[PDB]
Scaffold this active site. Sequence first.
Site, short mmCIF file in Angstrom:
data_model
loop_
_atom_site.label_atom_id
_atom_site.label_comp_id
_atom_site.label_asym_id
_atom_site.label_seq_id
_atom_site.Cartn_x
_atom_site.Cartn_y
_atom_site.Cartn_z
N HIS A 56 0.88 -5.86 -1.70
CA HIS A 56 1.38 -4.49 -1.61
C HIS A 56 1.84 -3.93 -2.95
O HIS A 56 2.33 -2.80 -3.01
CB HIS A 56 2.51 -4.39 -0.57
CG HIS A 56 3.76 -5.15 -0.92
ND1 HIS A 56 4.61 -4.77 -1.94
CD2 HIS A 56 4.33 -6.24 -0.34
CE1 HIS A 56 5.63 -5.60 -1.99
NE2 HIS A 56 5.49 -6.50 -1.03
N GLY A 112 13.60 -5.91 -5.96
CA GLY A 112 13.00 -6.40 -7.21
C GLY A 112 12.73 -7.88 -7.08
O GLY A 112 12.28 -8.48 -8.05
N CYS A 133 10.73 -9.19 -4.70
CA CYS A 133 9.46 -9.47 -4.05
C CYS A 133 8.60 -10.35 -4.94
O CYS A 133 8.47 -10.11 -6.14
CB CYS A 133 8.72 -8.17 -3.72
SG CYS A 133 9.47 -7.16 -2.42
#
Lengths: 300, 299
Positions: B39, B141, B143
């Site tokens: 993503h 932040g 991920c």
Amino acid sequence: SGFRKMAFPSGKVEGCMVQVTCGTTTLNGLWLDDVVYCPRHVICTSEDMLNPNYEDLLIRKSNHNFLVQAGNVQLRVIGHSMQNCVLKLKVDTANPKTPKYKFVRIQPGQTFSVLACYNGSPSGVYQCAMRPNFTIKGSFLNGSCGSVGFNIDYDCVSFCYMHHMELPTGVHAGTDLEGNFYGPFVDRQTAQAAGTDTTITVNVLAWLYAAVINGDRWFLNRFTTTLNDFNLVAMKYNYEPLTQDHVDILGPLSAQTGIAVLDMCASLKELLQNGMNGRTILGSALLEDEFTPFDVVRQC
Amino acid sequence: FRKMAFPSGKVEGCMVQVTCGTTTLNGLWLDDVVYCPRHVICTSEDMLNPNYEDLLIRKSNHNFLVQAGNVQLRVIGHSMQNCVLKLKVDTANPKTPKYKFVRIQPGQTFSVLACYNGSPSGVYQCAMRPNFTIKGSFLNGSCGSVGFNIDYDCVSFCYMHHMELPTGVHAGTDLEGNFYGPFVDRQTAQAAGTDTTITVNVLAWLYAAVINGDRWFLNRFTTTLNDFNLVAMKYNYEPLTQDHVDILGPLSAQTGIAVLDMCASLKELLQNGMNGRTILGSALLEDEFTPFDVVRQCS
């Protein structure tokens, strides 16, 4: 919700851990630049531990009595000194992985990470706080002596603790990196008494302020109290007394929130008298006292 | 007793920052491949209902910025394995350790290196919940942060952070892009199921209390699996199996207490309570220590 307890990444410390063997006694050491720091009781046998004469035992030792091993590479001792309760072994090779480092002495209530090591080999890392009785409550099996505690700020590692002894109730005691013991303890196998462990009041209040910032507000009351009245009630629950210095440190959190410090103190008093009643604060069913104000403020 | 995490040195050297457009997250640098959530190619508008297959044929190698500290790595290829993007770079990571990709099962434990913009910030031990979620400190932040275990010299990577659910819990995949649980990588309303308590892990923790000398919950009674599974289900405790008994077998010989004997103590603690007392310091029963964790931290 969520305030989980994070330890510091340990990579910068892992490359500094070595094994020190004097005789049949083996513990961990800290290799920075050209010096290996280790507990001085590495030169003692189990019999010397009851009444040790450290000055008599070291005059009888030579550089070749010390085996320092960084993995499989053996280091050569070219000199030795004793600073308080730590031995400083000068080696021929500097540590290529030396990080930017300081030595700091901490106060009770302060937090740090511990790298538990066995025979020069790192095994685990955990976060802890120095208890008001100058003890640490961690898991340190025989062989962790020499393990160190540290904080990492902007690439600088601040070494603040080295493990020396296991006290009879299961708790641990140690020195700073200059060899000065935290608390009234000594490196002898004598009967030493840890004082009463108390709850770090300033740390509970900072965590309760973080709960309000994250939404949880069920514990709030309409009342306020004076410091003298709060301290009188908290003593009954084994809570450390609050000083004006603690009130001023919580100032920023009392500005982001509208709750004054003496108002939060009234809420904490009510929690102590009633309990949690099945409810939770930031995911915890217990009052947490191992989160310093500094950390909460930075993470708002 | 304390929840100890694995030392993170071998993983710290593999963390990089991946930027595509306005989105910046963390990636894993192993050999000449950078792994990160897919993503990262999606805008906030695309997250509503994304066609990843189409959004990628448009993207080119110059749309991805990979940074290892101050050095900048050059993407020379891209591919997708399920919900993970694989970016081929020009340089191999000289700090690549002995590694393997494994998938774990609910109830198993692992350490997580929480990172922000390619920068390691913290480490903690956690367990995969029976609802396939992880309670954690991830913030924003984080991920692409990875979970791992260390066996001697081999680092086993078992998890990569992808989404944060509105219960404060987190969800993710394995390193082959296969999600843990019924979640998908889209900005939609997603719900985690009833979290249950890991019974095999509580029994392992009770064995550790007896090894440590806390032996007050011990009783003279014994029960049977079905007898206990009724109370277990009633109290929201995972059913126990014969395999669970076989794994606790070792701890049952270091202590003398059999699994069904110990199960009669847990049954009393669930109905009757701790009758106002403490086990290993807590008023609550811990379920994030596996039997293997207890053996290594004690025996």
